[PDB]
Design a protein around this ligand. Structure first.
Ligand SMILES: CC1(C)S[C@H]([C@H](NC(=O)Cc2ccccc2)C(=O)NCc2ccccc2)N[C@H]1C(=O)O
Lengths: 99, 4, 99
């Protein structure tokens, strides 16, 4: 699609068989989901935002579908206000800023 | 915004 | 003009004389700027993301020239990591997301 910014950019992702709304987020390097059950192992990551830094759990090669589009990347699980879909998976699904 |  | 998200999406912004650069960010509702002093009165606000909340000074109808193009709107001045160009001015310069 073509998504305008007058409304917040929520889209349905589908991770592990459940639907969730995540935000299309260009200000973000990574994809940061709220606390959930990812499969396998994790490693620790420091990631800062606006309030500053936080410790996340990182899962590699997670298959998340986004508006019926498949990415296989690195998902960070942590305390975010909302589900962030960041640059890492936006490049995967061929997302561009247009003006 | 999300860095690092 | 398609912008790719291979790299963090940073543009020049011309503000009060100055050429600064900011991040085009679909995750931000409002525009936050490095601590500076705008003309007029402000309303204090708390904006929070990852790592929590910070305290900004709201200034209504501030003219930003975002990579050539002008946009009026509210601008927050606070302790931000990076100047952020949010959804507020983005639509103004008719920015959109595609895939
Ligand atoms: C972590 C986030 C992705 S969400 C949060 C957002 N805040 C703002 O825009 C405030 C702000 C303004 C300018 C610059 C920085 C922050 C909010 O509270 N969103 C509720 C919400 C989100 C999605 C769906 C429904 C509701 N900030 C984002 C970010 O750190 O950039």
């Amino acid at each position: 699609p073509q998504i305008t910014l007058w409304q917040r950019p929520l889209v349905t992702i589908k991770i592990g068989g459940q639907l969730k709304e995540a935000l299309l987020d260009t200000g973000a390097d990574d994809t940061v989901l709220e606390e959930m059950s990812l499969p396998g192992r994790w490693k620790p990551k420091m990631i800062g935002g606006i309030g500053g830094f936080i410790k996340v759990r990182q899962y590699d090669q997670i298959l998340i579908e986004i508006c019926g589009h498949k990415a296989i990347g690195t998902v960070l699980v942590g305390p975010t206000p909302v589900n962030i879909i960041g640059r890492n998976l936006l490049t995967q699904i061929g997302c561009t800023l247009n003006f | 915004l999300q860095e690092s």
